[PDB]
Every structure is written in C-alpha cells, then in structure tokens.
Amino acid sequence: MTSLEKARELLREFPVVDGHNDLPWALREQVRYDLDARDIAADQSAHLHTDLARLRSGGVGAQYWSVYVRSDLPGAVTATLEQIDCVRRLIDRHPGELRAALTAADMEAARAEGRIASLMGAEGGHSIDNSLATLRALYALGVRYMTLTHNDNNAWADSATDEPGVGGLSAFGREVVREMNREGMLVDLSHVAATTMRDALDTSTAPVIFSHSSSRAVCDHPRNIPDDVLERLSANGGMAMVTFVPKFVLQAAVDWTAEADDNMRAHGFHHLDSSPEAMKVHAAFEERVPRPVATVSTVADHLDHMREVAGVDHLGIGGDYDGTPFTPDGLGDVSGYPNLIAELLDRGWSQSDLAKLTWKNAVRVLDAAEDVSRGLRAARGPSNATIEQLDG
Ligand SMILES: [Zn+2]
Ligand SMILES: [Zn+2]
Numbered sequence: 001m002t003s004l005e006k007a008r009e010l011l012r013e014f015p016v017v018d019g020h021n022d023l024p025w026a027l028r029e030q031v032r033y034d035l036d037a038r039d040i041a042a043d044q045s046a047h048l049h050t051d052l053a054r055l056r057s058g059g060v061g062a063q064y065w066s067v068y069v070r071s072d073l074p075g076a077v078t079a080t081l082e083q084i085d086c087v088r089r090l091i092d093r094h095p096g097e098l099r100a101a102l103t104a105a106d107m108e109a110a111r112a113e114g115r116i117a118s119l120m121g122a123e124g125g126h127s128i129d130n131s132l133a134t135l136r137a138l139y140a141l142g143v144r145y146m147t148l149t150h151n152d153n154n155a156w157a158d159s160a161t162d163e164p165g166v167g168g169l170s171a172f173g174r175e176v177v178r179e180m181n182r183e184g185m186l187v188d189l190s191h192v193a194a195t196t197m198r199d200a201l202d203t204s205t206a207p208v209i210f211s212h213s214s215s216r217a218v219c220d221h222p223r224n225i226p227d228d229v230l231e232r233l234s235a236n237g238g239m240a241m242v243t244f245v246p247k248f249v250l251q252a253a254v255d256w257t258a259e260a261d262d263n264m265r266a267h268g269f270h271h272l273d274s275s276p277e278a279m280k281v282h283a284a285f286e287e288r289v290p291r292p293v294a295t296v297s298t299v300a301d302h303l304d305h306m307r308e309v310a311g312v313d314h315l316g317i318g319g320d321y322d323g324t325p326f327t328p329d330g331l332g333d334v335s336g337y338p339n340l341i342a343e344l345l346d347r348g349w350s351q352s353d354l355a356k357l358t359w360k361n362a363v364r365v366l367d368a369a370e371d372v373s374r375g376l377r378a379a380r381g382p383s384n385a386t387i388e389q390l391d392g
Pocket of ligand 1: 123191212320323
C-alpha cells in the first residue's frame, strides 16, 4: 500500500492522542458557545480546524480540549468554568462520537469503543487565581493538565514570551507543582520560560508534558524546547508533544514574523495592535514580503531531532488546532495527521515507534501521574499554603 494507506491503518489501531486543541475558545469567540451555530456533527471547515468528521478522518482517538482563558482580563476563573462547561456540553451533545475521559483507563475504554476520549487541559496558571483550593476544584471538574503560564508571566511563574519575572518558579510556583503532583494533574511546560522548565523538572516527582511545543535547536523561538531540557525528559519520564504552528517549526516563518513585528513598531504600533490602521500597515508588509509556508516535512524534521535527543518514548503530538491562525501545508486542519505519519514512515520510523508517538506515550504519562498521586495522597494531606506565606 502507499505510506498514506499504511498510516491510516496504523492509526486505526493506535490513534492520535492530541495534546492541545483550542476549539472551546474558538466557540467562545465566534458564537459565545451557541453550539448549534457551529455544530461539529456538521462540516465546520468554513470556520474551524475541527469537527467530528475531520477528527475521524485524521485518526484522532483522544483529545485534550484546552480550557484556555485570557490572562489580561478580569474574571479568569469564571471564564475557565465556562470553558469547561463548553467541553462538557460538547461531550453531552455527541455521545456517539465522544467519551469523557479522566484517566488512562478511560482513554483505553474509549479506544476499545471507538469513541474519542475527551480530556481537559487548562492553559495558564492564572486560571487558578493564586489559589491551591481552586487548583483542586479544577481537578475535581476534570482538568488533567495545566500549562503553568500562557504568554504572560503570572505571580509565581515566568512565561517564554515575557520578560524575566521570578526567575522560573517562585516558592509558591514550586508549591503549585507539588500540589499538581499530589492531585495527579500533569504539569504542562508549553508557553513557559526555559528557567521555568528547569525549575519544574527539578521540583516535579511526576512525568511532565509539553502539550504543544517543538524543538528550539531546529527553530529558534522561546516557545520551543531547548535540547538540555529535552535531555532531562527521559529521566523525568515525560513527553514533548510537537506542535504545527508555522512560526514555531519553520525558521523562515520566525524570521518573517520578527520582521513583521519590527515593521509594525516602526510605524509606532504595538506588534499585537489589531486596529484597522495597524492592519493596513501589516497588509502592506505582507504584500512586499509573502509569508513563508511550512510543510509536513518541516514538522517531521522536529520529530526526528526530538527523537534523537529525548528518545522515542518521550514524544507525542499537539497540533494547536483552533488555537493558531496558520498551518503547514498538508496539516491544514485536524484531518491531516495521516500525512505526518506517512512522512515518518517514509523516513523509516517503525510501527512501534509510531504507536508510542500517537497513543502509548500519552497513556503511559497519565498513568504515571495517577500512580504518583496515589502515593502522595496516602502520604500527606492537601496544602493550605498561600502565595503571601511563601512568596511574601
Ligand atoms: Zn498555546
Ligand atoms: Zn491554546
């Protein structure tokens, strides 16, 4: 058969566990959670990277649904609960295709049934409002990872896309990691500074994840993972779930964005200004200089390198679909994963290497977090510490 044909067959047995999809935020922003207006049992290709038919076509067998909220607005906890409610309602509307999953055993149950295991991951520590009880409440509601920051620092952790703050994790930051370990919530080090990565790896007694990051050696962006951190993953037992964001996998796209940003500032605009005035400026840039386009091969180059540095047992996939406006050719929406698996086959990746990449590493890591949690929950009670107490 072709490599594509083979990829599809492999994915039927060991499907993709995708680590990060922002469909809930996209539904919030497009239709304020009116789910009939973006029904995923219908074709939503005009509006979204995701719907049920494309997930099936893509070989997705489990999804960490992001319950991301902005870190620059008040009421982040309320909005996080609204994000979680969005995911719950989606599961309840599509029981034929989706199955709530809280544990590694739930994931396997879903695979056995042919339903897509639906998990939740919070995207940024601001979602807990400096409160360990709030962290515990998010776990209770089903959240099974938390990205320690989003694009901004928070009071106790530094972000990759902000200036240095506390130097990685503060004392409270370390207490958050310890409580995540006790609860069994996976520590997600996507979006955080390299300092934060190393401090988390020092502190954590459970395997950690990167739910959507690629390789800083291949594409130099602070959103990507340095080799020294990748090297620490086998000892930690965790995994890096490669992402498709073109400016994190193609060096030319990083360079292009950096030039776009400079051009915006040269016109007196913040690089994120979205005003129509700012927009005409950017339009003129893009007309002078076309945006470079990443491909499936770009992403495979990351996986080859990450495999060499971290090891095949420490890899997964996290597309960032409905979380990023641009995508690589061949990976335009959630139906694309077989194209990536076929490229890897063409590069000589074995069937067991690919079963680990797609399914088994993710299941292992969540099981390990549950195992660590069993031991810590038996060993001590939950923390009542506050940020004032530990950080001043
Ligand atoms: Zn993200
Ligand atoms: Zn996101």
